[PDB]
Design a protein around this ligand. Structure first.
Ligand SMILES: *[C@@H]1O[C@H](CO)[C@@H](O[C@@H]2O[C@H](CO)[C@@H](O)[C@H](O)[C@H]2NC(C)=O)[C@H](O)[C@H]1NC(C)=O
Length: 40
């Protein structure tokens, strides 16, 4: 094993978490830099 299959779950958690947090953070950077209601 249950620990060896728990390393498998967090290995594929960490791949899609990094690419998808980057889009959530870059879109928030563009709003705080450039106030438009298009960017809300
Ligand atoms: C701030 O955000 C607006 C979007 O609301 C940007 O306006 C775009 O500007 C590009 C040119 O750089 C145009 O091709 C787009 O059509 C524009 N979009 C809209 C909805 O007008 C604006 O450029 C941003 N400011 C900066 C400095 O990047």
């Amino acid at each position: 094993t249950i620990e060896e299959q728990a390393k498998t779950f967090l290995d594929k958690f960490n791949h899609e978490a990094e690419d998808l947090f980057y889009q959530s953070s870059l879109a928030s950077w563009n709003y705080n830099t450039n106030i438009t209601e298009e960017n809300v």
